[PDB]
């Protein structure tokens, strides 16, 4: 069985025992989270329905807070003398799936 | 005419690698009991003793 779970504005296809990198969640390490789902496949069924799916919630565990890859930015235009350097590191949260 | 641009490393090296020495082939000769190797065109001279093996 596997489910399509929504978090951070994006959706992930997960199964029990999977690790996922989602957007940062305001939760420490080791405690439990509950997330809404958009589709549950238990074999042949899909459950395909908001009324039923509003009762199903995947249960997760926070494994820690990692960072994304470092993004180097250097904006440049042809003959102006214009440059603008900028860096970025995205904050994430690693999730272990234990529910469905 | 003058070169408009300097050639890249790859283009210089392609033409430069084709400048090479041709290797001549050597055959065995036994003169005065000793064995040597000379180019095949010098066999007569080697047998008559006109070749100086240094």
């Amino acid at each position: 069985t596997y489910a399509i779970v929504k978090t951070g504005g994006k959706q992930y296809k997960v199964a029990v025992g999977d690790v996922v990198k989602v957007e940062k969640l305001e939760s420490e390490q080791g405690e439990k989270v509950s997330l809404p789902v958009a589709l549950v496949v238990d074999g042949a069924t899909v459950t395909t329905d908001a009324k039923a799916l509003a009762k199903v919630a995947v249960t997760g565990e926070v494994l820690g807070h990692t960072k994304g890859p470092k993004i180097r930015i250097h904006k440049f235009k042809n003959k102006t003398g214009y440059h603008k350097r900028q860096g970025h590191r995205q904050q994430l949260t690693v999730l272990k799936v234990t529910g469905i | 005419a003058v070169p408009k641009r300097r050639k890249s490393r790859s283009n210089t090296r392609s033409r430069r690698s084709q400048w090479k020495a041709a290797k001549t082939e050597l055959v065995g000769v036994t003169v005065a009991g000793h064995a040597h190797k000379v180019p095949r065109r010098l066999l007569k001279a080697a047998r008559l003793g006109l070749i100086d093996f240094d």
Binding site: - | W19, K20, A21, K23, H36, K37, V38
Partner: protein, 113 residues
Amino acid sequence: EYPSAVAKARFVRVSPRKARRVIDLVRGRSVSDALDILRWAPQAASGPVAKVIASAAANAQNNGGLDPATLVVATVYADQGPTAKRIRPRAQGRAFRIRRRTSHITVVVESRP
């Protein structure tokens, strides 16, 4: 890996490209089969290269106590030496530069069955 000996010839008054042309003739060969190749090569740089190869073989046989019939030219290359600069007068008060290049020739022979 294998027992080996080294010889060098530094500040040899031969252009590095002209030395490499004849070094490519003997790279990888046995010492006996390279000495005669260099003997019969018509190029001028074949003299100094042969001298260095012979010296390396002598070092292997004497200093290392190896067998001459087992020696093979493992690595050989020609690096650049210092370059002297001269002047050739040309037409209409022009003065062009002439480069006298030298080479460093390095040979490593090794004994292997």
